[PDB]
Design a binder for this molecule. Structure first.
Ligand code: NAG
Ligand code: NAG
Ligand code: CL
Ligand code: CL
Lengths: 368, 368
């Protein structure tokens, strides 16, 4: 009795798709199996996302796993909400009410604000990507008013890859001389290197800097292979490689064939890929729970809109799932947001990245 | 030889629709006439906007006049760009590349930055609406870094209409005591009153405040009927009631029947309605120019996408239009952005709102 689902993957999301496939093997059974229909697309393109979503809807899927970005998130939220089709995603979470969107990614804003306070910063630069979210900007600016921080918030987004050389010159002119060496990096991975390299290049107090990397994958990729030149570096991690569940997963992931599973055959996994694997567990558990409870379960532009009648039952089952995964304890509130999770707080130290503590909604920051 | 166009109106946009209809009467001829197909919808709803756009596309329209907001703008940009359907709009302009979107509204960021500098502010609050744009935020924060301003940027958006009373208490706690009385209001009209009333309510230095209203309709509605309590108030205006063209328009608008034309029978017109009237002139002129040049001119989700072959000819004709309208000189760059326009700079003075100067891209601010 195969369960039809959609998968909407950004082009080039190879490791995430490998993790998706490993999840299907691990969490599938002899009798029950998810049957995915995969669309690879440019998620920044709302026409493309709309077309993929509607195609999946017309096929008759029971849920869609996928990604969105800043430009397409409203298409996903509006179509899911209108048609009662559940969308499970590792993409950035949103604060608004969004029925039918299950957000695997824990919110990071609270942990970031707690870390700023932990280091007792009161003056710092916030370098963010216009090509990324803005919920974190807002939160930082709003906290600055309350906490009396002096924030220099520079949208490092939309760089012509041309004037780049000198959009950094004016950037560091403001910082370097204002003797502002506490810096939060909230952008795409590549722009991190591009900014850090600009600090060592114009060699000045290179080691006097302290960077906070505002993402959930501090130790992902060769991120920490950069030449920070003795500067302090801190960040966040949702995948704890010392946890029993993660260690067992890596025992397998580390042995996989690269040809079959691009991005595997390593001892680490990107947090987005980990969340993708966890999403498969969540979906499998939801459908298994519908079976236990004996709950039996086509035109996108049809007018009037015909929402899926059973949609609410699947949405409910998904949000009621409680399991442990690669991203720790997984539990959802009624709006599809992660709750009762933990984010590990990391510092780059003499012998490599080290966990110095953790953050939860209830307790805020706890030092190990 | 009627020309089929679409019209996508927000529910309750009565004056704008009246101005649209008055435009059709004024700019239509005996032989050539625009035949609009109107959809009234919630523009914040991307499903609804997608459905309306696709319905218009399948009808065979030659262009669409309409509105979007922050949540639906990407649907409009992506669908227009993909299908080569031109969208002419009074809604907020965007900075990205957007083929096939003609933005009637002049950019305001430059004028705002020039006005801040004119008053020689170096410390101020920027109160903005999360339920509005963020391009202006970015620009202000980016200028603050360069100009060494101290900006307190508070997202007054998303107020539960409940905790409101005390989300203002914490708001003014930060401001009132930090003796920050220079304030930029960049939000929806209603939230202006809601914020100003909170200043007079907690009566303290009420007259020591200076507000800048960041919109293009300083004298629109009863906006300036508020009790500012002697505070200074400045703003922007794109409709100049002393200009000959505007005066002639008002000679008619002031006599119209309210029953037939809701929002008319007044001596003023909201800037959004003025831009709507101007959009009709622009569309009429474009199609007339296609005729002069002897240039002869259905499934939204069709795969592969089938762009309209003649789409590029209409897009070109629209962007080449150069006329005077209610919003002054109308001319477009290749990205559909207004250029060579003028924004009037206004202050509220003893005898009412007064023009103190103007701003253009080329000259920045000029004092009268
Ligand atoms: C789980 O989360 C809720 C809401 O954040 C919190 O109130 C509750 O105390 C948490 N439970 C535990 C055991 O941390
Ligand atoms: C019109 O706009 C362009 C670009 O902003 C500018 O370079 C040009 O000088 C302007 N023309 C006049 C007469 O202001
Ligand atoms: Cl120094
Ligand atoms: Cl005082």
């Amino acid at each position: 009795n195969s369960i039809q689902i959609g998968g909407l993957f950004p082009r080039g999301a190879d490791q995430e798709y490998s993790a998706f496939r490993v999840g299907m093997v691990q969490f599938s059974t002899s009798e029950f199996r998810l049957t995915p229909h995969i669309d690879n697309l440019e998620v920044a393109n709302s026409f493309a996302v709309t077309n993929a979503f509607c195609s999946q809807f017309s096929r008759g899927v029971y849920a869609i796993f996928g990604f969105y970005d800043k430009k397409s998130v409203n298409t996903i939220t509006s179509f899911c909400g209108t048609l009662h089709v559940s969308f499970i995603t590792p993409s950035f979470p949103t604060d608004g009410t969004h029925p039918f969107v299950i957000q695997m990614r824990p919110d990071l804003k609270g942990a970031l604000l707690s870390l700023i306070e932990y280091y007792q910063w009161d003056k710092f630069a916030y370098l963010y990507d216009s090509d990324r979210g803005l919920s974190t900007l807002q939160a930082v600016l709003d906290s600055a008013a309350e906490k009396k921080w002096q924030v220099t918030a520079i949208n490092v987004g939309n760089i012509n890859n041309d004037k780049k050389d000198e959009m950094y010159r004016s950037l560091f002119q403001d910082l370097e001389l204002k003797k502002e060496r506490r810096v939060i990096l909230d952008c795409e991975r590549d722009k991190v290197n591009d900014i850090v390299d600009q600090v060592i290049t114009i060699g000045k107090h290179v080691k006097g800097y302290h960077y906070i990397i505002a993402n959930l994958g501090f130790t992902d990729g060769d991120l920490l292979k950069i030449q920070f030149g003795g500067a302090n570096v801190s960040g966040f991690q949702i995948v704890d490689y010392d946890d029993s569940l993660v260690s067992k997963f890596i025992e397998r992931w580390s042995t996989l064939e690269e040809k079959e599973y691009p991005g595997a055959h390593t001892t680490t996994i990107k947090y987005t890929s980990a969340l993708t694997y966890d999403a498969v567990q969540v979906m499998t558990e939801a459908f298994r729970n519908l079976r236990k409870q004996r709950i039996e379960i086509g035109d996108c532009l049809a007018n009037p809109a015909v929402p899926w009648g059973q949609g609410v039952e699947i949405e409910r089952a998904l949000k009621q799932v409680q399991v442990e995964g690669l991203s720790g304890n997984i539990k959802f509130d009624q709006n599809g947001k992660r709750i009762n999770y933990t984010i590990n707080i990391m510092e780059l130290k003499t012998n490599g990245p080290r966990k110095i503590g953790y953050w939860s909604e209830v307790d805020k920051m706890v030092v190990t």
